[PDB]
Amino acid sequence: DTRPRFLEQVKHECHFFNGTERVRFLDRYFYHQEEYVRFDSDVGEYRAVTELGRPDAEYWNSQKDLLEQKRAAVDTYCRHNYGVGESFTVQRRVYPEVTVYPAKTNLLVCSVNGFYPGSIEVRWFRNGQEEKTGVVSTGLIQNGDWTFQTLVMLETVPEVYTCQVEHPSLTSPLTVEWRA
Amino acid sequence: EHVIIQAEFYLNPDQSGEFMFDFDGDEIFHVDMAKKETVWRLEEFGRFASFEAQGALANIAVDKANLEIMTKRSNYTPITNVPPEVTVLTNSPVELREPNVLICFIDKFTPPVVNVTWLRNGKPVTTGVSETVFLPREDHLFRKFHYLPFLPSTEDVYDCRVEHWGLDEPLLKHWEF
Amino acid sequence: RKPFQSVIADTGIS
Numbered sequence A: 001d002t003r004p005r006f007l008e009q010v011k012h013e014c015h016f017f018n019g020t021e022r023v024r025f026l027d028r029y030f031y032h033q034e035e036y037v038r039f040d041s042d043v044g045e046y047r048a049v050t051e052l053g054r055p056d057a058e059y060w061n062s063q064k065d066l067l068e069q070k071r072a073a074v075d076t077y078c079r080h081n082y083g084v085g086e087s088f089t090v091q092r093r094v095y096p097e098v099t100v101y102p103a104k105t106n107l108l109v110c111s112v113n114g115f116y117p118g119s120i121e122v123r124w125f126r127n128g129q130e131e132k133t134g135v136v137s138t139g140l141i142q143n144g145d146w147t148f149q150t151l152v153m154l155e156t157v158p159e160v161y162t163c164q165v166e167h168p169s170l171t172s173p174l175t176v177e178w179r180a
Numbered sequence B: 001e002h003v004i005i006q007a008e009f010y011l012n013p014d015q016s017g018e019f020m021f022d023f024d025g026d027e028i029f030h031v032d033m034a035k036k037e038t039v040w041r042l043e044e045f046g047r048f049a050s051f052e053a054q055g056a057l058a059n060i061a062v063d064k065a066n067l068e069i070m071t072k073r074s075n076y077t078p079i080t081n082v083p084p085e086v087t088v089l090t091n092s093p094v095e096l097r098e099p100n101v102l103i104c105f106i107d108k109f110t111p112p113v114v115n116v117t118w119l120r121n122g123k124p125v126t127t128g129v130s131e132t133v134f135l136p137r138e139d140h141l142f143r144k145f146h147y148l149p150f151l152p153s154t155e156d157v158y159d160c161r162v163e164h165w166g167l168d169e170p171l172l173k174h175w176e177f
Numbered sequence C: 001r002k003p004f005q006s007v008i009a010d011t012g013i014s
């Protein structure tokens, strides 16, 4: 396929700080991956992000009913949709599954699977005390299905090893034990 | 604390569009523009919420209008192809005879056109496979997931085959027990 | 129960 490609994106972004106590709405226009013009609710009118967006910003800023409508969007759009989705997004809790197994390169893998939300602390312990400098991880992995996972690996010569998991779904830490 | 993004694109000359809602990087729903129906990322979301899927066509029609304008304004500057990072991992730790899911993660690419095939022992498999639509990234590139439910065996190897205009050859990511 | 609301892009000038 010889033909050249041309792509327009638009992202209508609602940013929430302390639930709906503080909201910022951003109406962002893209040509390929280059933002050319944006509306920001903290500014209350359009601004050109590049040369290519100057005509659209002038044009749109001259239509006062258009700007009037966009400035109500923190209430009619952002706060409305937070309120629609809260109970199954903001309040979604899915518990982690924790396994420990040895791997080749010798590694103790602490696998933490199927949890929501994303915020998690995984710590390695060897006979009592905490190891940081021999630990390597996957980072947080989004599975694309409203579920994360992470693999936290201890580079070690296998004593009693304990993997500690802290997640919002758990009243207290989950601590899994592995004996050599 | 949280971001909700209504993200849309339109692409010429393919005339491919997409309309979708994202919460903190997860898809809430997209509109199937053909059928005019709301496709919920999880079944359960559709018990709590509705959408006017009919109206998504109006939004895409504005994006096409804007594209035609920006195409001329840019002097017909075409998109630069960016080939994907591809990674293959399981839902959970693999145990023999314990059903599991292979995830193919296709990340950081444009334009949003991609051929993905699951290969079992080098042959295409479709039983049970599902995929997401193109998902937006903070850098305005795309990411995408394909899923293959499978029964783990010592006798099968798997590959995710990914075709994109940014790549010389198709890209194969290997997995095996 | 409750509907999600979309906003529409503004159309630019030629």
Ligand SMILES: *[C@@H]1O[C@H](CO)[C@@H](O[C@@H]2O[C@H](CO)[C@@H](O)[C@H](O)[C@H]2NC(C)=O)[C@H](O)[C@H]1NC(C)=O
Residues within 6 Å of the ligand: A001, B113, B114, B115, B163, B164, B165
């Ligand atoms: C995805 O697969 C399709 C079809 O399998 C590829 O397309 C075709 O091959 C060339 C493209 O220049 C054309 O002569 C045909 O019209 C297409 N065939 C079919 C059956 O559609 C398409 O290019 C692939 N996409 C990518 C990114 O490689």
Ligand SMILES: *[C@@H]1O[C@H](CO)[C@@H](O)[C@H](O)[C@H]1NC(C)=O
Residues within 6 Å of the ligand: A018, A021
């Ligand atoms: C969030 O909202 C309430 C006001 O309704 C405020 O009193 C509270 O302190 C806020 N929380 C934080 C962490 O600021």
